[PDB]
Amino acid sequence: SVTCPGGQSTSNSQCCVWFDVLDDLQTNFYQGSKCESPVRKILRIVFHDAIGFSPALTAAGQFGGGGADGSIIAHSNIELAFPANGGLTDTVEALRAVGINHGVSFGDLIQFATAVGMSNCPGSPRLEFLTGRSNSSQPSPPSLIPGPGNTVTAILDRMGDAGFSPDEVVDLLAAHSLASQEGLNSAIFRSPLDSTPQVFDTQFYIETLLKGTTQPGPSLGFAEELSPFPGEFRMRSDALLARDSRTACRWQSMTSSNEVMGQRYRAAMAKMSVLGFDRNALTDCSDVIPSAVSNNAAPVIPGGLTVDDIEVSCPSEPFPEIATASGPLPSLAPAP
Numbered sequence: 001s002v003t004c005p006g007g008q009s010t011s012n013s014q015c016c017v018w019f020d021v022l023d024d025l026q027t028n029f030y031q032g033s034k035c036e037s038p039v040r041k042i043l044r045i046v047f048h049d050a051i052g053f054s055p056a057l058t059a060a061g062q063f064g065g066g067g068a069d070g071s072i073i074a075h076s077n078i079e080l081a082f083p084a085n086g087g088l089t090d091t092v093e094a095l096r097a098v099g100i101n102h103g104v105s106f107g108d109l110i111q112f113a114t115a116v117g118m119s120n121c122p123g124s125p126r127l128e129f130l131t132g133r134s135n136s137s138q139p140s141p142p143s144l145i146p147g148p149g150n151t152v153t154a155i156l157d158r159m160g161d162a163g164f165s166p167d168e169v170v171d172l173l174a175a176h177s178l179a180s181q182e183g184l185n186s187a188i189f190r191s192p193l194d195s196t197p198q199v200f201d202t203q204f205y206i207e208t209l210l211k212g213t214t215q216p217g218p219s220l221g222f223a224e225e226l227s228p229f230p231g232e233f234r235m236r237s238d239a240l241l242a243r244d245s246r247t248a249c250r251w252q253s254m255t256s257s258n259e260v261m262g263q264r265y266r267a268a269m270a271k272m273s274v275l276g277f278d279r280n281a282l283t284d285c286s287d288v289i290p291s292a293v294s295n296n297a298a299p300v301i302p303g304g305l306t307v308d309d310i311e312v313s314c315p316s317e318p319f320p321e322i323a324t325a326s327g328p329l330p331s332l333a334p335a336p
Ligand code: HEM
Pocket: 037, 039, 040, 041, 043, 044, 047, 087, 146, 147, 148, 149, 155, 172, 173, 175, 176, 178, 179, 180, 181, 182, 183, 184, 235, 237, 335
C-alpha cells in the first residue's frame, strides 16, 4: 500500500497520478461529474480506439493496429477522417490536453475516462482500471470499425477477428443504453437509442425488440429503421442484432436484469481494454474508480406496449416476465 500526496490511500504508487486526473476530469471534462454528451462521446472513443486491432492482418504480415493504444488521439489527423469517427474532434482535443498535462499515456487515459464517466451514470457497474500502456502507437489501419449499415455476418466476423464471440458483441452493446445519434439524422440531433440515455439499464435491449412503428424525424436517415415511439432513434445494426438467430437469445437474456447486464458488460470491457497489450504487464488501479449511484427502477415495457409488441426472436427461450407500464406512448426528448 501507499498513501498519495493528497491523503488518498492506494495499492501502488503508479495509481497516485490518477487521483489528480480524476479530479480534473470530473470538474472540467464532465462539468461537475455529469452523465451527458462527454460520457457518450468517450464511450464511442474507447470502442473506436480499441477496435483498431486485427490478428488476421497480422498473421498475413500486415500491420493490424495496436488496439487500445490511444492512437485515435496520437494520430487523430489520420483516424478522425475515418467515416465512423465523425463528431469526435472536440472530445479528442479535450482529452489530448488532459493527458499531456498529467503526463499519462493516451491509451490509459481513454480507459480511465471511460470508467470515470460511467460512474456518473446511475446503474453503471464499476469498470476495472489498469495503467501502464505505452504512450507510443501507430495509426490504426482503416476499415476496422463496424458500421451501422453492416450485415450481422460482417459485424460478427470483424468483432470475432478482434477476439469477441457473438455473446460478447451483444454484451458490449449495452453501451447503447447511454446513447444518442448526432450524425445519422441531423434533423433529430441527439435522439436517444433508449428511453433512459442517462441510465445504464436494460431498456435498450427491450426497446429495440419492439415492433418498429414510428419515423421520429422528417425523413429516414442513414441506417435508420422505424422505432417504437416518438423521439427514439433505431439504428439498423441494432435492430438486426436483436433479431438475428446468432445473437437473439443473448439479446433477449439482457432484457430482465440490470445486474446481469452490468456483470457481462464489465467483463467484455475488461477484455476490450487490453487488446494489443498483456494484462499481467499492467498495474491495477481499479481502487481509484468511483461507484455509481444505484438504479432502482425495474425493467419495463413502456407506454402501454406488451409482450405482444415484442418481436420475440429467441425460440429456445421464452421471453422473460417484465413489468408493463401504462400508456400512452412516450415521446423522448433529446439526450443532454
Ligand atoms: C456493433 C457495433 C456498433 C455499431 C455499428 C455502432 C454504431 C454507432 C453509431 C453509428 C452511433 C451514432 C453516432 C452518431 O451519429 O453520433 C453510435 C452511438 C454510440 N455508440 Fe455505438 N456502435 C456499436 C458498438 C458500440 C460499442 C461496443 C460501444 C462502446 C462500448 C458503443 C458506444 C456508443 C455510444 C455511447 C454512443 C452514443 C454517442 C452519443 O450519444 O453521442 N457502440 N454507435
